[model samples]
Target: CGRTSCHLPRDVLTRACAYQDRRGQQRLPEWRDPDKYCPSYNKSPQSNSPVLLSRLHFEKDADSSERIIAPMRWGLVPSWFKESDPSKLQFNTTNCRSDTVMEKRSFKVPLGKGRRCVVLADGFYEWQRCQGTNQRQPYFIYFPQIEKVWDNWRLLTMAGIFDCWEPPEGGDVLYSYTIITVDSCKGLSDIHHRMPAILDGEEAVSKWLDFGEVSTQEALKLIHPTENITFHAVSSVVNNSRNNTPECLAPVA
Candidate 1:
């Protein structure tokens, strides 16, 4: 329930590659068709975005530590779904509650199967409910921009779980993912009570992505709220899922 709308950029793939390449690692080649994955500044559920997962899923003999990038639907479609169309899913899969992931069949099945992944994003958007006017104010949350000594901008590596769903009617397999959410940290509690489970740094990212080595319980331990993020308010133009522009991230007075 935490993530309904978020923001990504066209350069997400390039920046994600650079972030993961810091260890001089080799990843499986990116998805063949790039046209279908047009990430935007204001993205909604069901949209395609880049997700980082271990290559072990693709190659049995490959090292489980090796990572790969793929464009996947933001909302997760459980493998057991019988519908021919993904939209027909009866419930929301955009965000899974961290505490209950192990109990919910949709998320538990994937987590038990080691389908963990890192959702690459510049940041995500959250709306604050106003008690007085009953109007919600949107805020963009992400890692603060740093000086260019090592890197200027960094991508938010959010904890996520992915699954492969084949349409009952038959077609190419569909890869979809759900961002994990936990109770917001003290810093963000005033804006929203829940926030995406962010994998803060290299160590946490590596540990979470190495599903081959990290057990389900260990991975679940990493899916908690992080305080390393910052945010600023933006215009209500982003309230419209169709609106895709730089202004969605522009800080407003």
Candidate 2:
């Protein structure tokens, strides 16, 4: 679903299934192919993927870490950009790999100081092996054996940095962020060669945010492969962003 019609969990709907009926009525002009936007929905339920949003909390807490959790636009926009058109925004880059952040001008300044944050996600989507004529197929990724799929959702503390861009007229500030990715671990390699860099734990997250304590290389060590992570091919319905329901995550046969 496009951002305008997208439903966040805490929004109006009291039940998850109700979204299906509501979505039917609010459907925008149907795209020619659902696969273009929600590749995971067209397939089976088990193969479905979950959309992850980064939560940033702006208040500072002396008792705990004072940090901001924000849902950054998947693509990143350097603060210096002169315009704020969606056409100029890139979608696939919600995650920015840490290894190259310092070298990339788009991320250098934010990574240096301004936009440090943690991304929240139960799981993420990625494409597995590509076949002849067909490019790589998609896979939904997450850690297995966690309790409560919805509440107490497992936190995949993504290594992220954001930038705030002001419009020419300077109305509302538009924020964007990227996740840091690194080579995938053994189990994950079956679905994709690369995976997002997940912070090891609370201590690691603190170390990452601590500018004085760690070097980029040392900070990287905080991201270790999660051995319990798993993946499955879900319905291609997810291929179309229009189909934004739990069904999109159902596994495919």
Candidate 3:
């Protein structure tokens, strides 16, 4: 399977929060270092993206239902990583397979400790390898429907695990995340063999984030491929990570 990347335009970030408030069942999440985050149309690995996690992860005594939106790097940096620079790490952790998450040291450590997060994105990008060619066709996958207020927007909430790494040299703490992946659902199997584990609705989202109420074993049950997603083929402009524009989301003719 190929690496999964995502896009979360700046405006979409606000609507994502609005989505959480649609039912009026909870308070909006507090934003942390908003200025340090820059949403992208073509966010690749190592890029800083917004992550929603239980506030308890931040404060030992805070309510788990309370959430915090913080900007964390996409690829998770294990707490035990000895490197001074996160990018210098040797392995690819952008997507952790669900079947082996419990066995992998990098993911298992955080999962067991309740470092769960909901990866928020307008949508994610997946590539389909064509027969016998070096070229790949990229598709933008997202929720099918739209709300009246948000109009053209729908947020894709994905299951993920996170870890905080303090620089061995004594710098600010670095928080990073890895999107969990499961076998592709029937609807998207033609696109790829694997897809990000999607939390289908508000209830699923809540259970995954409210680590205080939901145990690690119970939350792991939420990591599964969902058939509710839809996608459309797009221009390869996205394949070049440097090209960041609305054109990347434009559907092909």
Measured by lDDT, the strongest candidate is: 3
Which candidate wins on TM-score?
A: 3
Candidate 2 structure quality by residue, lDDT tens digits, 82-178: 7557455544344566567778887777766535555445456676675565666656665563414554344345566667678775666656666
lDDT for each residue of candidate 3 in 97-170, tens digit (9 for 90 to 100): 99999998998889888999998877888899788897889998888875252455667889989998999979
Quantify how close model 2 is to the true structure by its C-alpha RMSD in Å.
10.9
lDDT of 1: 0.78
Per-model C-alpha lDDT, please?
0.78, 0.50, 0.81
Q: What is the C-alpha lDDT profile of model 1 across 1-253, one tens digit per residue?
A: 3433334434544554553433566444354335666757777788887777877888898677777777789899989999889878877589888888988898899988899998877788999987878899999888877713114357778999999899887898888999998999999888899999999887788788887889998888887878898999999887887888777777899
Each candidate structure's TM-score, on Cα atoms with residue i matched to residue i, is: 0.89, 0.67, 0.91
Q: Order the candidates by lDDT, highest first — what do you get?
A: 3, 1, 2
Error of 2 at 42 (Å): 12
Candidate 3 CA-lDDT value: 0.81
Q: How far does residue 189 in candidate 1 sit from its true spot (Å)?
A: 1.3
